[PDB]
Design a protein around this ligand. Structure first.
Ligand SMILES: [Zn+2]
Lengths: 175, 132
């Protein structure tokens, strides 16, 4: 079953804006958008922060849709579980909306490959905020533990945690 | 894929992680079709923010592979603030904008100089998926 595309769009815009609030970046930064889907989050990066960005997604159909949006960022067909294919210290920050739980679909190896290479691809002190939909607490702890081993500090923000409908989880990390 | 992206994208192959030749990729001058996109507005704050990170030798290499050798051999340097820019600074920043942001590869291919793996770009989008 499904949600209206306008409704998914509104929710994703809100989560992207919240992620950006959590990131607290300077304008005109260089940002990696991980699991960018059709580029809705990239649109907001451009407009809200005047940021320049690269978007990564595993899905050809999402990226094709991204092409139709007149985006200013670069879309790339790639698999976050194989690592972040950028040189050391490339990005100011990274953002990810509704995507990283896919890493859990060997998962523990892919999770470490993701966090180790992301740590490397961020400038020193670079930040990463990811909204994600965990299946359970163990999943949350596994992700947090992997980030920790990779060298990230920080923690977790849960908005509207009393709400079973509206509860959202944000990983908030610094390198 | 913007020229700027060529200055950060490296080989995705894990065995190449610690190889000096995983970056920059080697772009095929005979395959890469370039596009100028004037729609992306001049952003001098971004350029000032990015310049220290830019790998000039890698800019020179990729640009030469794409048929541009009309670049200064030394990385342009700038004051630390927008207000301190001169007209000459501004002109170079503008040239940097055109080069880095407004120039992209619409269709083409490039390979790792370490492992030889060849990556393809279609409709501006590089395919970075790694086969079995
Ligand atoms: Zn390689």
């Amino acid at each position: 079953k499904y949600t209206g595309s306008t409704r998914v769009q509104h929710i994703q815009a809100k989560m992207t804006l919240r992620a950006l609030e959590l990131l607290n970046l300077q304008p005109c930064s260089f940002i990696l958008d991980i699991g960018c889907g059709s580029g809705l989050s990239g649109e907001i990066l451009t407009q809200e922060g005047d940021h320049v960005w690269c978007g990564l997604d595993i899905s050809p159909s999402m990226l094709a849709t991204g092409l139709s949006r007149e985006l200013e960022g670069d879309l790339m067909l790639q698999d976050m579980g194989t690592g972040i294919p950028f040189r050391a210290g490339s990005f100011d920050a990274a953002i990810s909306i509704s995507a990283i739980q896919w890493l859990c679909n060997d998962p523990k190896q892919r999770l470490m490959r993701f966090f180790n290479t992301l740590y490397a691809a961020l400038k020193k002190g670079g930040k990463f905020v990811a909204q994600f939909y965990p299946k359970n607490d163990d999943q949350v702890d596994d992700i947090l533990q992997s980030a920790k081993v990779a060298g990230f500090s920080g923690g977790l923000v849960v908005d509207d945690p009393e709400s079973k409908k509206n509860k959202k989880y944000y990983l908030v990390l610094s390198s | 894929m913007k020229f700027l992206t060529t200055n950060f994208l490296k080989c995705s192959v894990k065995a190449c992680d610690t190889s000096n030749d995983n970056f920059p990729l080697q772009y095929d001058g005979s395959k890469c079709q370039l596009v100028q996109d004037e729609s992306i507005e001049f952003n001098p704050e971004f350029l000032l923010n990015i310049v220290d990170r830019v790998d000039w030798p890698a800019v020179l290499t990729v640009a030469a592979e794409l048929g541009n050798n009309a670049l200064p051999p030394t990385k342009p340097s700038f004051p630390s603030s927008i207000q301190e820019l001169t007209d000459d600074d501004m002109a170079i920043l503008n040239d940097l904008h055109t080069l880095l942001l407004q120039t992209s590869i619409a269709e083409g291919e490039m390979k790792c100089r370490n492992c030889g793996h060849i990556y393809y770009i279609k409709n501006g989008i590089p395919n970075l998926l790694l086969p079995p």
